[PDB]
Amino acid sequence: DNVNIPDSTFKAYLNGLLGQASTANITEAQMDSLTYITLANINVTDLTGIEYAHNIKDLTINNIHATNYNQISGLSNLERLRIMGADVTSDKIPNLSGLTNLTLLDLSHSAHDDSILTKINTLPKVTSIDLSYNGAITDIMPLKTMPELKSLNIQFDGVHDYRGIEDFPKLNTLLAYSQTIGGKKLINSDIKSSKLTYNAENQTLYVPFSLMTERTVNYDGYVPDFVKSTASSDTYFTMNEQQVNGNRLTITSDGLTVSDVSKTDFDNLEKMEYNARIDLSYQSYNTPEQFQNGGSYTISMPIYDHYFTVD
Known about the structure:
This protein has about 300 residues and is mainly β.
């Protein structure tokens, strides 16, 4: 009965909880007496020995720069779990399907991508998940399979499509304010110059919004318009890596129109970027029934970012 804890910070911490000198030894029972571990902005490179904390209910990990978090997967009595950290990419978290008593999962403020879902969407007791501030998460439908999920926070992510949200059995709270579609996982289309419309006489370039294939869609098919404002806090249009002047632009629902464009400018066109707010006010859209009794459904005010190459 002596637990091997190779990381000196880690072990210093545990000794701490047990009221013991930094480098003191720790036995199989002392590990078993813990009820929580909180490692916060301390550098712990290696979590070896956490596996012996069988009775921990709570484990908060913030910014420890571990190479992975592999050793938490067996902590079957865990109730709440937080892992946060700008360096926490999705490969570092193993499968959590073994965390069968876990009621609360919070992987916020990290470097997460879509692959994180398949590791967390079998969790049987988890009623809330926080994946907010993970910019490169763009689709939450794989969590429809979770039996017990009531609340999901994806604030500040890149989610674009809410069709299928009613397949979630128990989700009564969706917090999705201020998504930036294409902010971390970038969106690019390769298009022929024929998809566009040039007019010789008026020297106008027209880009149809049928090209913005990743524009917000509410569960019910509603497709909110882009904002009409030409101010650079609202729209940011780019030709050949150059932001067009706000005044050169006209925005309808169907498209964007640039004045002062010669056939010369038109032939000499390789690159575009449409980066604008989508006019999606809290009161401007319907909310599904399951969120209507005390629930919340906020998909308000997203931002769209789409890069193009022209042929």
